[PDB]
């Protein structure tokens, strides 16, 4: 009875998707002016990570970025002058995520030690010290995103997105619904919703206030490794192991467009939009990133300058440059 | 004012002094990943290393090893195993006694061997609880060919060095399981990565030397491949 009722509920959901699929984004946007061949050159290369860079996060000022490497270092770089503002020795060498607070006062990181450690940069003492440890997750911390100086949203490998109160260090809200390791987040501009791709080819739109899954999107054929909202916050794009990126629209609730190429048989590690959202920047496992025209699904260009797998990708909040970490321990900035 | 520029430059000189100081320590220390199961006996081998994740230190001949056992995670390991692609070697520990679970360890070995990211890492494969394997063969109740029909057409390899007072039946069994692992190792592993099979029990006072010894062969061959020798 349960199996039949659940399956028959999916029928009208699929029917309403086909009903509202009046046309295709390709058909509507087939007459727009193409973005044309885009050539971004490496502007600065940041050196001094010993091991592979796994994560990276820009600051809100578009100047400082924080990078994590698999050797217990959280180096905060100055992208203008290429200087190490701070180097934080992490307790566990294995760190899979890092976030820089919107205020820039604190910096977070976590990995296979199951703890989203918060480090206080504004300590009056010589160097930085660990602010608080966030225990309560039972799986590798895939991603950690700040909401404000006291609220942090985390993801783990135990199908658990959690929202924490860093003052008390207690998991206030837990988000449950994923059937797979949750690999990434993306907060909406207003920080009221956040999407979350997991290892079950299903991105779920969560509600921060309620803790309930507002919507669930499928269309991918493998683990989703990256996800990012469109800068307005009414859509998002995802990157999976099936060597394609799919753009989903919250209000329409279908797969608007897919970014796949015949010669590409490598998964996507990271995606990110430009400030205008016209370019999608997907970081492939074939050691370079490709710049997809988000409205035409055309390869505008390629950022080929990494020796190893591209692990992370960021665009500054003013959009003036694109950082790109990789497993070759080198953090390059593009423009 | 130019004062802030010099202080920013001054910190970078002090920061990059610390990174160089800790770079020597990081490169001089070998990282290992320990893998197995509930009944494998990873817990017993880490006890022999007396010289959410579990960090084991042992010093052999003034060389530091970090042995990383991962405890916290779920049974799905296809995304956190990508962290350990830069390790020296994967210490894969197998329970050779339980033949029911022994096919699952072969599939786990195959996924590691053929992994797009682990395809350049050597595996120091340990076949633990060989004492419990011997008493299983001698009893005769548990039959290998029930699980592995190919064992009916197997003979002890010519490269066999049985221990004194070892029954022929044990050596025929204990080498069929080893040889079964090496079918996957020799199918696709071509100089990129190497398997180092071994036979350990719970009462051995070694497996730290063997890791030290097998790591030295891994590092020796790594150097020789750069010189286009191997």
């Amino acid at each position: 009875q349960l199996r039949q009722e659940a399956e028959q509920l999916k029928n009208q959901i699929r029917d309403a998707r086909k009903a509202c699929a009046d046309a295709t984004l390709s058909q509507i946007t087939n007459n727009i002016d193409p973005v044309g061949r885009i050539q971004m050159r490496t502007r600065r290369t940041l050196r001094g990570h010993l091991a592979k860079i796994y994560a990276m996060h820009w600051g809100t000022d578009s100047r400082l970025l924080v990078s994590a490497s698999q050797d217990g270092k959280l180096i905060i770089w100055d992208s203008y002058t290429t200087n190490k503002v701070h180097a934080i020795p992490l307790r566990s060498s294995w760190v899979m995520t890092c976030a820089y607070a919107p205020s820039g006062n604190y910096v977070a990181c976590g990995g296979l030690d199951n703890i989203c450690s918060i480090y206080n940069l504004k300590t009056r003492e010589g160097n930085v010290r660990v602010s608080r440890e966030l225990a309560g997750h039972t799986g590798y911390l895939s991603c950690c995103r700040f909401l404000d100086d006291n609220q942090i949203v985390t993801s783990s490998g135990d199908t658990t997105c959690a929202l924490w109160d860093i003052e008390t260090g207690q998991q206030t809200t837990t988000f449950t619904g994923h059937t797979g390791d949750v690999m990434s987040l993306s907060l909406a501009p207003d920080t009221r919703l956040f999407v979350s791709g997991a290892c079950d080819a299903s991105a779920k739109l969560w509600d921060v206030r309620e803790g309930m899954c507002r919507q669930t999107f499928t269309g991918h054929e493998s683990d989703i490794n990256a996800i990012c909202f469109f800068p307005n916050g009414n859509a998002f794009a995802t990157g999976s192991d099936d060597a394609t990126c799919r753009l989903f629209d919250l209000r329409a609730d279908q797969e608007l467009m897919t970014y796949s190429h015949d010669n590409i048989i490598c998964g996507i590690t990271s995606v990110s939009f430009s400030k205008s959202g016209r370019l999608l920047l997907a970081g492939y496992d074939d050691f370079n990133c490709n710049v997809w025209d988000a409205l035409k699904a055309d390869r505008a260009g390629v950022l080929a300058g990494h020796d190893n797998r591209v692990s992370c990708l960021g665009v500054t909040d003013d959009g003036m440059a694109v950082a790109t970490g990789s497993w070759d321990s080198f953090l390059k900035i593009w423009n | 004012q130019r004062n802030e520029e010099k202080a920013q430059r001054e910190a970078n000189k002090k920061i990059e002094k610390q990174l160089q100081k800790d770079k020597q320590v990081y490169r001089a220390t070998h990282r290992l990943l320990l893998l197995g199961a509930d009944n494998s006996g990873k817990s017993t081998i880490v006890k022999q290393m007396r010289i959410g994740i579990f960090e084991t230190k042992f010093q052999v001949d003034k060389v530091n090893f970090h042995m990383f056992d991962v405890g916290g995670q779920r049974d799905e390991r296809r995304k956190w195993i990508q962290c350990f692609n830069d390790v020296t070697a994967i210490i894969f520990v197998v329970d050779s006694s339980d033949y029911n679970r022994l096919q699952e360890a072969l599939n786990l070995f195959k996924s590691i061997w053929n992994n797009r990211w682990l395809r350049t890492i050597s595996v120091i494969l340990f076949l633990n609880k060989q004492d419990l394997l011997a008493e299983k063969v001698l009893a005769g109740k548990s039959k290998i060919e029930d699980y592995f029909p190919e064992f009916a057409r197997y003979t002890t390899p010519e490269d066999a060095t049985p221990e004194p007072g070892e029954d022929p039946r044990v050596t025929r069994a204990k080498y069929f399981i080893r040889d079964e692992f090496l079918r996957i190792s020799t199918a696709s592993g071509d100089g990129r990565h190497y398997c180092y099979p071994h036979f350990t029990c719970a009462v051995d006072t070694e497996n730290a030397r063997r890791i030290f010894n097998d790591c030295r062969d891994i590092i020796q061959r790594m150097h020789l491949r750069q010189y286009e020798l191997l």
Partner: nanobody
Framework: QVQLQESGGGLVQPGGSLRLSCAAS????????MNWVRQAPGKGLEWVSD????????SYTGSVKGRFTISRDNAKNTLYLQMNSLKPEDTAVYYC?????????????????????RGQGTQVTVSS
């Protein structure tokens, strides 16, 4: 959506023949190394057999080697497990498990407790 709906299964006397069919949907069938896994009553998941992308390389658990035949039909996007001889040991639920990544010979996590790309499963029980 990725969907795997197995068919076949039921009571067959020992020595019987049974044809399990796995109709894949919502992905390119031709890429993934399809597997077969089964769960004995009061027992953990175990792997039965697999098949490569084009059907080249085929392996079996050994407990069913020579008794079970596996083939994939890329025309209709279907997987098969032709059973020849059944033992009372074979009583289990067969799940049609798919390989996570599309173009790789490795297959991590197919026998996992909560794997995503596995089918619902069909009870295959043997008795007279």
């Amino acid at each position: 959506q990725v969907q795997l709906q197995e068919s076949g299964g039921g009571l067959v006397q020992p020595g019987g023949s049974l044809r399990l069919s796995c109709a894949a949907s919502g992905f390119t069938f031709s890429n993934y190394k399809m597997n077969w896994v089964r769960q004995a009553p009061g027992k953990g998941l175990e792997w039965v057999s697999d098949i490569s992308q084009s059907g080249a390389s085929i392996s079996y658990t050994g407990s069913v080697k020579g008794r079970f035949t596996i083939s994939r039909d890329n025309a209709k996007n279907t997987l098969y497990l032709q059973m020849n001889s059944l033992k009372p040991e074979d009583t289990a639920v067969y799940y049609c498990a798919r390989c996570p990544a599309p173009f790789t010979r490795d297959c991590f996590d197919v026998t996992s407790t909560t794997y995503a790309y596995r089918g619902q499963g069909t009870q295959v029980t043997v008795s007279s």
